[PDB]
Amino acid sequence: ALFPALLLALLVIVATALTWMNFSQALPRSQWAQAAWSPNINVIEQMIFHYSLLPRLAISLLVGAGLGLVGVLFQQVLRNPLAEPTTLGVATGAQLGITVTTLWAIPGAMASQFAALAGACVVGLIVFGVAWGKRLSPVTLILAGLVVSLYCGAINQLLVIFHHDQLQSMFLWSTGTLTQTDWGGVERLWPQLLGGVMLTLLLLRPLTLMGLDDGVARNLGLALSLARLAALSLAIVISALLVNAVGIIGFIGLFAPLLAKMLGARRLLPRLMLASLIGALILWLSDQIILWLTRVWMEVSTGSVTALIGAPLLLWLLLAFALAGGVLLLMAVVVALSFGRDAHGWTWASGALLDDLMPWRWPRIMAALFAGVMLAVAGCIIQRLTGNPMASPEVLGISSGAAFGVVLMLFLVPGNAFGWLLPAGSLGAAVTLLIIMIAAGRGGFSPHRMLLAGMALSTAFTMLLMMLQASGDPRMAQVLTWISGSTYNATDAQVWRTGIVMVILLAITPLCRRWLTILPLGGDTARAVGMALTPTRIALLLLAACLTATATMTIGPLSFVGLMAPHIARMMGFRRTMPHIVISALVGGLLLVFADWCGRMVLFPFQIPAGLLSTFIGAPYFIYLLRKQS
Amino acid sequence: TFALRNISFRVPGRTLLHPLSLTFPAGKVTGLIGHNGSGKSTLLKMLGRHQPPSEGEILLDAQPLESWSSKAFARKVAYLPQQLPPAEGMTVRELVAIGRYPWHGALGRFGAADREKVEEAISLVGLKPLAHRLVDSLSGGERQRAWIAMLVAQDSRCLLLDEPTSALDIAHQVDVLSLVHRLSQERGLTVIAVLHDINMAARYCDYLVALRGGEMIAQGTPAEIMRGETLEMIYGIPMGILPHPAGAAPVSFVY
Amino acid sequence: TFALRNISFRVPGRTLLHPLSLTFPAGKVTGLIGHNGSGKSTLLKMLGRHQPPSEGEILLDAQPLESWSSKAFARKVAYLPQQLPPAEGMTVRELVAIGRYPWHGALGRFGAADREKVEEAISLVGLKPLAHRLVDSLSGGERQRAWIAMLVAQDSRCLLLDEPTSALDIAHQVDVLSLVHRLSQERGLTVIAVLHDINMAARYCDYLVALRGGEMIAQGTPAEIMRGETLEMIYGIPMGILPHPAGAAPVSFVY
Amino acid sequence: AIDPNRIVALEWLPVELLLALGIVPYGVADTINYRLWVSEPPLPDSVIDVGLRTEPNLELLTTMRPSFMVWSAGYGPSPEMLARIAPGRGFNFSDGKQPLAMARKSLTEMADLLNLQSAAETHLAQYEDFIRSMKPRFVKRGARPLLLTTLIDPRHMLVFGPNSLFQEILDEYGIPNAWQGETNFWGSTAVSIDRLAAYKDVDVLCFDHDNSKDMDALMATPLWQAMPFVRAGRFQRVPAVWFYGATLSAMHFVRVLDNAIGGKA
């Protein structure tokens, strides 16, 4: 226990030294007591911005404590060791509120209200289901949370694609600058945070039971449904207040409870207090480093830097055949309609107009189909080799790594970094992709730690994208479409090449049928059967990585279809390797073809990327399937 | 003091499903035996209120049929999960203290008494150290004994054990059965235990009942039921029985 | 048949270390009996290459060291691990095609050439006319038979099983032990089975090995194992032994 | 292009150049946001909207017969997909130092391509005359630094750096820029409010575009009231102009500066 205590003492002394240095550079020490304690500070300019420098420290400490609290609560309620407030949709709902109240007037505390609304809607959809009883479970809870998070993310993406010049403020709000100009934020957060800690001190034994198994929790007589609903509502409310105070953060509440448990604290309230203190300390460190940076070079955000410095720390501390023929015929006829049907007056290509519009339709639809099929196969393979329902193509780090490379290229060099000879562009994206894949493979030996590293790298990519969008970069829109997975740059030659790659990969796939069959229900039994665990697990990971690589090379970094097609194929009633594979592939292909046709035709002038329409079509049907089997 | 009338376990088809009706003793030891979960599991799962009674009524000490307050319910019965051992825990003392949940409630007034009961529990189970390091660091027997200590501190009128004998050693089975029998003699509470081994139920239970699929075969005292001609129709294998000077109940051996 | 000369143990887990020395018979049943944390489970996990030993090494076949290829190891050893079990197989009758992996391999399998092996396996494990018409969620009696189906389809030279008798009834355990003994008598197979029950294991064994504390206690035939001193030393409780009226192994009874 | 009536533009800066030349645009990508932001050059209502600036609808383009599909070099579709529909050219506009220079260069290029050199010469002459006309209106103020800001939220502000589009106007008028810190290649940086406290004798000019409530929430705080540039009477609100424009946006900015600080000292 010497190492955690020594690290904590080092963090405290570094925070104190940085705060002393910043406060002395801002104001001489001989005028500190006259500036802090006096409610009517002197009119001196050097002494009056202490009205803004002091609230930044207080808001940082309070938000760190709140982050630790919500991390502990999300760890206990969902019974998962990892906290995930953003995946629950509280951050995305708050962003949606900010972007819908930034336009059409109607202002106020939009983040908290809309995040609470999203939480209440999720609670209602889970309690409803198909039976009078709620029958809520953590797995379906997290699934629905991810679904609504992706849905609000897609609505926000549509709103910024149609209006990006008028949401720059929102961009800053999505970076967590926590820059304060008065005491209003602290005076509004401290009473609500006091109410939060008061409600946390109460109902502690329900939290202890929620941390244990649900069986003994219902045995002890705790209303598991009502208690879990109330705890989730409290967590969503506190997270909404925090993201209304500062905004999107670098998951300090994901390091606070783990450090508090590594240091010690067997009981619950000591662990809560230590987690809050450690979160406040991390936010203090990050805020002081950001202040020093803006004093010496560039005004960068706080949450993005927090995530960028926490990622390496986390890496260091780490009927079938008939249904198939039916969906294939459906895809064939729907491709025929998308070729024939148009949007300029809803005309139909009767022949002569077909070859004139074919060079702008056939490549796009074919690329969307190939990308959907390949993403569905990759997602199914990942969920089969891992076994977790939350597994997505982003788990590898392929899409997040490629986008990281593109945004790094846009940051390092100015100008048209997409097609410039001096700029790397595709080559830079590819080399950063390979580097990110190698790092994710070397960091996590087990699929679960690899999943954690992939989620961390995805959050880091999101933070870098929000950094790129916060600044007035004229290119932030262009790459945005590429982030949204648009089939607009598809070419006949690229279509031919990705089709050849797809048929090669789908011919290699049946050779992995035995592996994809034994790895399920495996572990030690798989090794006892006669197959090598790691030499085949790395092989399947490389196959899925190549699939995702060509998918992002075709359509771009999107993984909603790759996450949804396996789930929908499993909920249809297909649970055999090759049947599930082909069904998920065909479902994803038809879904992405429908999404492309919608994004190209539902609005004739404005073309929305297919990645947004994929979500817009999959989310309602998926929540319908979830309620039908809840 | 429980009287069960189970016409249907569940609408969807189970391996075997048949109606039955029986009254449990007031202060004796009840031993439910059967072939795995083929009808035997549903009985105690429905008693634990994890399974709907379909078209049958269950008298809670002659109070009502169903839909009773969960607080008094947990204060009345103490149920053990059926081959679902809790994999979470930190301290044995923390566990046996949190076992006293349904007495003080969520906003519990634990700052007063309730310490003598947890002390008596941790002294009865045989654990000399009051608070160990980690409830998961101990062996399986010790953590299961801590679970029994939690169920003791719960202060229940009925003790439902769903297969405590399973995944345990024979000597551990004997020790746990003797402890449960001495506990039932001490507190005068009804205990219903699920036992895979017939001899184990013959040893430390005063009223054995058997369901071969769910038709209610035989109920009786070990002296009343003749195992020789009964276990042959109970489990199929024509095993024999012979007296032993160790226990008053003659031991059964596979033929 | 492989033999062990290793000294290592579960040093990091529960802090235990003790030297081991044992040579298994050529083609006889080997019953591992003792406590749960006695070391028999860790011994079988060491035998199945679940984790590399820290000291010593297990010599196999008398001609090679521990370093063996996966398809060559599984071609001579079939491991029933019980713990971390294959849950939700989602397919029936195809499990024998999964077990046949080390024979046909991934390439050149020809969709399982010579299908006489799989049908012989599913017919000798049990006369079932319901093949390719089952679901994954069934009772233990058929689940264990489906488990041993692929192990028989492997026709590996050794069968290492830990706790087949667990979660099963006396009839199903009788069936499983009779199948194992018939396999060992017909194919001359070397089987090492872990069973908690002393008498049930001894009735279908020949060379029992008892583990207590950290080391091994005995290694004799069931006739010499039935002695009361050995049972007292390996189980703690004092039990007695008396000749069986018709069973080959005498009956042991707890006091 | 022989017919100037069917010219199509894919970015707002080509539209501004076309309106400066006097050519009537036939199709503009994203015209609603254009009419919302840019307001100095009146865009007609009969202009057919093509779609997004980054993803112009190709089927709508091929439906009509465009004679020249001018676009911004490095923004929009690939050059081959645009040359497959109609012959055109990608014009450079931004580099990180002199945006207005290359704006004028691309204007002259568009003139030489569409055979409109006389219109471009007349437009540049009128621009230079309008610039020289407002020269004595900014000489009596002296060498006091001017600060170009815009409100993002009641906590930050977007400040124009030494490489903005309004820097050639400031340099020609002998007006040094007040911001002398960090800067990006497009001429805008998001800084904090308290950082502006480091500037004493500066003439902060802030633009407004649907942010009156944020302005009130900012000026209601005592920290903003105690700022050095407001206590000396140097902060005034002026109508917003288009930052990333060309010559017409420059004329609008010059007129705004003349109505603001023109003839103060």
Please calculate the CA angle B206-B212-B215 and round it to the nearest 5 degrees: 95
Cα D192 versus chain centre, distance: 23
Tokens standing for residue A149: 């998070």
Using a CB-CB distance cutoff of 8 angstroms, which residues of chain C are in contact with residue B83?
167
Sole residue written with tokens 């529909």: D85
Shortest CA distance from D229: residue in chain A: A45
Amino acid at B141: G
DSSP assignments along A464-502, one per residue: HHHHHHHTT-TTHHHHHHHHTT--SS--HHHHHHHHHHH
Experimental technique used?
A: cryo-EM
Tally Cβ neighbours within 10 Å of residue A22. Answer: 17
The 3-class SS string of B44-100 reads HHHHCCCCCCCCCCEEECCCCCCCCCHHHHHHHEEECCCCCCCCCCCCHHHHHHHCC
Domain extent listing, chain A: 1-317, 319-628
Q: Dihedral of the CA atoms B227, B229, B230, B233 (nearest 10)?
A: 140
Check: CB of residue A98 under 8 Å from CB of residue A170.
yes
Chain C interface mutation, best of A521, A537, A572, A574, highest count of C Cβ atoms under 10 Å? A521
| Cα C81 to Cα C85: distance, rounded to the nearest angstrom | 7
CA distances from D219 to A167, A508, D155, D224 (A): 21, 66, 11, 6
What's the distance, CA A402 to chain centroid?
15
In single-letter form, the type of residue at position C234 comes to I
Helix (H, G, I), strand (E, B) or coil at C251: strand
Strand order in the sheet with C77-80: C77-80, C158-162, C190-194, C29-34, C209-212, C215-216
B207 strand-pairing partners: B30
Q: Has D75 been labeled as part of a binding site?
A: yes
Question: What is the 8-class DSSP label of residue A167?
Answer: -
Q: Which chains border B (3 or more CB–CB pairs < 8 Å)?
A: A, C
8 A C-beta contact, residue C29 and residue C185: no
**φ/ψ (deg, to 5) at A160:** -80, -30
Picking from C184, C211, C201, C217, the residue whose alpha carbon sits closest to that of residue C249 is C201
How far, CA to CA in Å, does B146 sit from each of A104, A553, B79, B94?
61, 57, 14, 10
The DSSP 8-state label assigned to residue C36 in this structure reads G
Task: Report the relative pairing of strands D203-208 and D236-239 from DSSP bridges.
Answer: parallel
Measured distance CA(D254)–CA(D265) in Å, rounded:
18
Contacts of C15 (CB under 8 A, 6+ apart): none
CB-CB neighbours of B12 under 10 Å: 6
Q: How far is D193 from chain A (nearest CA, A)?
A: 7
> Does B139 carry a binding-site annotation?
no
User: Tokens 């919302």 belong to which residue?
Assistant: D36
**How far is D18 from D70, CA to CA, in rounded Å?**
10
Three-state DSSP at B113 gives: coil
| A288 CB-contact burial (10 Å; exposed 0-12 / middle 13-18 / buried 19+) | buried
According to DSSP, the β-strands at B207-210 and B218-220 are antiparallel
Who contacts C63 (Cβ-Cβ below 8 Å, separation ≥6)? none
What is the distance between the alpha carbons of residues B8 and B12, in angstroms, rounded to a whole number?
10
| Token reading at A537 | 């697990």
What is the distance between the alpha carbons of residues D88 and D84, in angstroms, rounded to a whole number? 10
Provide the number of CB pairs (under 8 Å) joining chain A to chain D.
Answer: 144
Q: How far apart (Å, rounded) are the C-alpha atoms in residues A278 and A262?
A: 12
Tell me which H or E stretch contains A235. helix A224-245
In degrees and rounded to multiples of 5, residue C159 shows phi and psi of -120, 110
Phi and psi for B244 in degrees, rounded to 5? -135, 140
Instruction: Decide if A424 contacts A409 (C-beta within 8 A).
Output: yes
Q: What CA–CA distance (Å, rounded) separates B126 from A533?
A: 44
Domain coordinates in residue numbering, chain C: 1-255
Token couple for D166: 């309004």
Alpha-carbon distances, residue D3 vs A455, B122, D23, D67, D82 (angstroms)? 55, 98, 10, 7, 18
Specify the residue for token string 């420290």.
A57
Chain C residues touching A528 at Cβ < 8 A: 48, 74, 77-79, 81
- C147 touching A (Cβ < 8 Å): no
| Option in A205, A219, A266 nearest B79 (CB) | A219
Angle at A525 between CA A522 and CA A527, to 5 degrees: 95
Structure tokens at C204: 């279908």
D159 CA: distance to closest CA in chain A (Å): 11
Give A350: exposed, middle or buried? Use CB within 10 Å, 0-12, 13-18, 19+.
exposed
CA distance A419 to A425: 7
How many CB contacts within 8 angstroms connect chain A with chain B? 56
Exposure letters A585-622 (e unless 16+ CB within 10 A, then b): bbbbbbbbbbbbbbbbbeebbbbbbbbbbbbbbbbeeb
Residue A79: closest CA among chain B residues belongs to which residue? B88
Locate the DSSP E strands across C163-247: 190-194, 209-212, 215-216, 239-242
Q: Which fold is adopted by the domain A319-628?
A: ABC transporter involved in vitamin B12 uptake, BtuC (1.10.3470)
Nearest to B27, CA basis, from B161, B186, B190: B190
Element (H, E) at B171: helix B170-187
**CB distance A536 to A594 below 8 Å:** no
- Name beta bridge partners: C193: C31, C161
Q: Does C233 touch chain B (CB under 8 A)?
A: no
**Nearest in space to C226 (alpha carbons), one of C96, C89, C33, C25:** C33
CA angle A476, A479, A484 (to 5 degrees): 115
What is the assigned CATH class of domain A1-317? mainly alpha
In chain C, whose CA is at the least distance from the CA of B16?
C139
CB B250 within 8 A of CB B241: yes
- How long is chain C? 255
Beta bridge partners of D149: D159, D206
Q: How far apart are CA D106 and CA D119, in angstroms?
A: 14
Q: Are A and B neighbours with ≥3 CB pairs closer than 8 A?
A: yes
The values of phi and psi at residue C11, to 5°, are -70, -45
Return the DSSP state at A107: -
**Cα separation, C120 vs A416, whole angstroms:** 69
Burial class (CB in 10 A: 0-12, 13-18, 19+), A500: exposed
The reply to whether domains A1-317 and A319-628 share a CATH topology is yes
Q: Provide DSSP, chain D.
A: ---GGGEEESSHHHHHHHHHHTPPPSEESSHHHHHHH--SSPPPTTPEE-B-SSSB-HHHHHHS--SEEEEETTSSS-HHHHHTTS---EE----SS-HHHHHHHHHHHHHHHTT-HHHHHHHHHHHHHHHHHTSGGGSTT-SPPEEEEEEEETTEEEE--TTSTTHHHHHHTT--BS--S---TTS-EEEETGGGGG-SS-EEEEEESS-HHHHHHHHTSHHHHT-HHHHTT--EEEE---SS--HHHHHHHHHHHHHHHTT--
Kind plus residue range of the DSSP H or E element containing A183 = none
Q: Determine, for residues C79 and A575 on separate chains, whether the beta-carbon distance falls below 8 Å.
A: no
Phi, psi (rounded to 5 degrees) for A605: -70, -55
Nearest to C101 among A518, A521, A524 (CB): A518
Which one-letter DSSP state was computed for residue C9? -
Helix (H, G, I), strand (E, B) or coil at C193: strand
Copy the structure tokens of residue D100: 């207005």
- Listed in sequence order, the DSSP H helices in A78-176 are 90-102, 110-128, 138-162, 168-173
Helix and strand totals (H; E) in chain B = 9, 11
